[PDB]
């Protein structure tokens, strides 16, 4: 039945459609901003439309999946449906460990727009679209679309890119690069900081600290060598924030956990909140893990 690879190949095309929606909303000018729990907790027309497109498109082709999306939404336009699939991905053999997966056992975690606050600020390259695929509680495949990749290159440039990966195959669509030798460059939240977040970072002996939006964007920073660790000692992000990004990072030898070192779980019944934060690195994960203060750990219950 070739379920996993069929799913990944469709999710790739579905994520590309999502990128067209993200760009279309900016181009038409009205972001339809709704405030949820605070002025830094926003929902736009892009979040709502992309979620409708992704969920309807996946459910049309793979009705047995469990699909969980960030937005709590109440008839979808056929114009939002994506029926395509990547023929190239479909040509790749499924890793043998996943070859007998049944569709009803997959759980898909969707963040239709990740970095929404930064989207509304015009920090457009912070934005990603995240489609994460989990089996037996583990994140095993992921798609990350970055709709404004290349947007500063001029009117003749192609906009956007799609990064995808499967554990046992690899991760693709970017150039893997380690961060500069001899430096600790720690990346973290721009808009959702607090004292605990900054105290945990201080304990790492950073040479530089980057404050940017997006969980997907920060994993891209890790795999492209713009940062050496992603440290977020706080509640606030959810399973859809970490599912697809941890796959991409794990596929190239990195590691993402909570602040204690616990792996995150992705079964259908798990709580959405990542209540003990996020710690991630491409290389030297054990260094950063070793520097988390005990006081930070006692404050953050998984
Ligand atoms: N305190 C929070 N309230 C709502 N969303 C949050 C919070 N903290 C983190 N997030 C979300 O988690 C993801 C990563 O956070 P950030 O690094 O701030 O962009 C984004 O989708 C944020 O909107
Ligand atoms: Mg949100
Ligand atoms: Mg989102
Ligand atoms: Mg998010």
Curated annotation (Swiss-Prot):
Modified residues (Phosphoserine): 234
Signal sequence region: none
Residues the record lists as binding AMP: 189, 192, 214, 218
Tissue specificity annotation: Highly expressed in heart, brain, spleen, lung, liver, skeletal muscle, kidney and testis.
Entry EC number(s): 3.1.3.7, 3.1.3.57
UniProt keywords, alphabetically: Acetylation, Hydrolase, Lithium, Magnesium, Metal-binding, Phosphoprotein
Coiled coil (UniProt feature): none
Binding site for Mg(2+) 1: 70, 111, 113
The protein's required cofactors: Mg(2+)
Amino acids binding Mg(2+) 2: 111, 114, 241
UniProt catalytic activity: adenosine 3',5'-bisphosphate + H2O = AMP + phosphate; adenosine 2',5'-bisphosphate + H2O = AMP + phosphate; 3'-phosphoadenylyl sulfate + H2O = adenosine 5'-phosphosulfate + phosphate; 1D-myo-inositol 1,4-bisphosphate + H2O = 1D-myo-inositol 4-phosphate + phosphate
Activity regulation annotation text: Inhibited by Li(+) and Ca(2+), but not by Na(+).
Residues modified to N6-succinyllysine: 238
Sequence positions bearing Phosphothreonine: 116
Pfam families (alphabetical): Inositol_P
Any one GO molecular-function label of the UniProt entry: magnesium ion binding
Cofactor binding note: Binds 3 Mg(2+) ions per subunit.
Residues annotated as the enzyme's active site: 47 (proton acceptor), 116 (proton acceptor)
GO terms, biological process: phosphatidylinositol phosphate biosynthetic process
InterPro entries: CysQ/Inositol_MonoPase, Inositol_monoP_metal-BS, Inositol_monophosphatase-like, Inositol_monophosphatase_CS
Binding sites annotated in the UniProt record for Mg(2+) 3: 70
Protein family membership: Belongs to the inositol monophosphatase superfamily.
Chain's role: Phosphatase that converts 3'(2')-phosphoadenosine 5'-phosphate (PAP) to AMP and adenosine 3'-phosphate 5'-phosphosulfate (PAPS) to adenosine 5'-phosphosulfate (APS). Is also able to hydrolyze inositol 1,4-bisphosphate (Ins(1,4)P2) and inositol 1,3,4-trisphosphate (Ins(1,3,4)P3), but is not active on AMP, 3'-AMP, fructose-1,6-bisphosphate, Ins(1)P, Ins(2)P and Ins(1,4,5)P3. Probably prevents the toxic accumulation of PAP, a compound which inhibits a variety of proteins, including PAPS-utilizing enzymes such as sulfotransferases, and RNA processing enzymes.
Record protein name field: 3'(2'),5'-bisphosphate nucleotidase 1
Organism: Rattus norvegicus
